[PDB]
Structures are given as structure tokens and as C-alpha cells.
């Protein structure tokens, strides 16, 4: 059972969805910019507990070790 919390931003939601569908993994999509209940449920997860690292300009979301190493 898979849920994908999406947005109205076209780079990455479609990336995750294409990856999941191409691997034949069936999922249900909740758009947190059109489904207020979905965003309230995502906030009940520790989503504001994830840190964000700003390197002069770029943004790393979560502790992505190798990415932060490269900058």
C-alpha cells in the first residue's frame, strides 16, 4: 500500500509518480495543494521535523549526506 503526497509543481511529483508506475507499483495520489485533508494528514506526520540545509543558495531537504558533501 503506497501513498504519494503531491503538489501543483511539475518537476518532482511527476518524477516520483513515473518511477512508481513504471515499476508497476500501484499507488494512490493525494494532492496537498487541492486536498486540505491530505495536507493535514501529512502534517500529522513529522514533516516539519525534517531539517533543510541552505548552502549559499541551493536547498537540500533532509540529511542527504552525499549531496551536502558535493557542495
Amino acid at each position: 500500500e503506497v501513498i504519494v503526497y503531491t503538489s501543483n509543481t511539475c518537476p518532482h511529483s511527476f518524477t516520483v509518480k513515473e518511477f512508481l508506475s513504471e515499476n508497476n507499483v500501484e499507488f494512490t495520489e493525494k494532492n496537498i495543494q487541492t486536498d486540505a485533508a491530505a495536507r493535514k494528514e501529512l502534517m500529522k506526520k513529522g514533516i516539519m521535523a525534517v531539517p533543510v540545509i541552505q548552502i549559499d543558495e541551493e536547498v537540500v531537504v533532509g540529511f542527504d549526506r552525499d549531496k551536502i558533501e558535493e557542495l
Partner: protein, 202 residues
């Protein structure tokens, strides 16, 4: 996996743009809208230059493809040049409904009447092979490398990777997402770095 058929002018651009869309599985360019059998590029008749998009409906909606369709050209002018007319060929009544609704909404939101015509799809004929993946096919190096990898022109142009590559060559695709699609293809590593070497040469 669903099919849409659009027409918005010369189809090289539509091919290179729609083939960069995540959720689009494959693209073909051809001719549709006329009353003649097997039209050719210099013998279209009443046909329109069209693109057939095969898209994964779990990733992108027909309505989102329509958003992109009306985002690539502004048909606020009425021409009788059938080769370049703005048309939506619908395959079922749901496509017809969505297209008519969105056309009404655009007309109302911008105050300009839209001259895109929503018509039922009769026959979509393929265009000549030299029109398929036109930009990629003209970068002979990377083109023949990928064609040897996919084992034939037909297997190449019918693939998702070829659509993404033709889009990237046309500057409509980030190199990062090209890497992401190449990861999706799962190349046997050696062909992978060969292709990446050729693409980063540009």
C-alpha cells in the same frame, strides 16, 4: 496507457515538447483530419500535421496534456491553412467533454475566442521516418549510438528514452531528468556511460 491526438502547427516542436513530459510513454508525428488515405508531407491534402501521444494515465491527465497543448500555442486567429491548424482529435466522449470545457474556460478567462477545433479522430497516418524524433535523428553521433543500442529505427523512435532524448537535444529537458529517465531504462552500464559521454559533449 491512453492515447491523445493533437495538432498545433508543424509537429517537430510538439514532438520535442510532449516527448519531454514525464508520463508520456511515446510519441509519433503524422497527419490527421483530411479525407485522403496515406498522405505524405508534400501531399497532405486536407490533413493537419499532428502528434499522437501515448501517456501513462497514472502520472499525467488528459486535461494536463490539454493544459500543455494550449500552453504551446495561442490559436486566437482563424486560418484556412489546414496543414497547421489547431485541432484536438478526441478518441471518446470524455476527451471531447474535457476539451470543450477547457476551451470554454480559456475563452472566458482571456476574453479571446479560441479557434482550436475539437473533432473526432478518424485516421491518424504516420509521417515519414525522417520526421520522427527529428532533432535527435539529426545528431547523427548520439542518434546512431542509441539506434544501435535499441536495435533498429522503429524500436528507437517508439521508446520513451528516444522521446526524452529528442526533447533534451531541443533544449526542452533538464539533463538531470534525462539522467533520471536513463536510470528508468536500466542500461547495462557500459552503454549508459557511452550515451552520457555523447550527451554531455553538447
Amino acid at each position: 496507457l491512453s492515447i491523445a491526438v493533437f495538432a498545433l502547427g508543424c509537429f517537430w516542436g510538439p514532438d520535442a515538447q510532449f516527448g519531454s513530459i514525464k508520463g508520456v510513454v511515446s510519441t509519433r508525428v503524422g497527419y490527421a483530419g483530411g479525407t485522403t488515405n496515406n498522405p505524405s508531407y508534400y501531399n497532405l491534402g486536407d490533413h493537419s500535421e499532428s502528434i499522437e501521444i501515448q501517456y501513462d494515465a497514472n502520472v499525467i491527465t488528459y486535461g494536463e496534456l490539454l493544459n500543455i497543448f494550449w500552453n504551446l500555442h495561442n490559436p486566437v486567429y482563424e486560418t484556412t491553412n489546414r496543414q497547421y491548424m489547431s485541432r484536438i482529435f478526441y478518441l471518446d466522449d470524455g476527451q471531447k467533454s474535457e476539451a470543450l470545457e477547457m476551451k470554454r474556460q480559456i475563452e472566458a478567462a482571456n476574453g479571446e475566442k479560441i479557434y482550436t477545433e475539437i473533432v473526432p479522430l478518424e485516421n491518424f497516418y504516420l509521417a515519414e521516418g525522417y520526421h520522427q524524433k527529428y532533432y535527435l535523428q539529426n545528431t547523427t553521433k548520439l542518434y546512431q549510438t542509441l539506434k544501435a543500442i535499441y536495435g533498429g529505427f522503429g524500436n528507437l523512435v517508439r521508446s520513451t528514452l528516444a522521446a526524452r532524448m529528442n526533447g533534451y537535444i531541443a533544449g526542452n529537458l533538464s539533463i538531470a531528468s534525462l539522467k533520471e529517465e536513463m536510470d528508468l531504462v536500466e542500461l547495462p552500464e557500459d552503454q549508459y556511460e557511452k550515451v552520457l559521454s555523447i550527451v554531455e559533449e553538447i
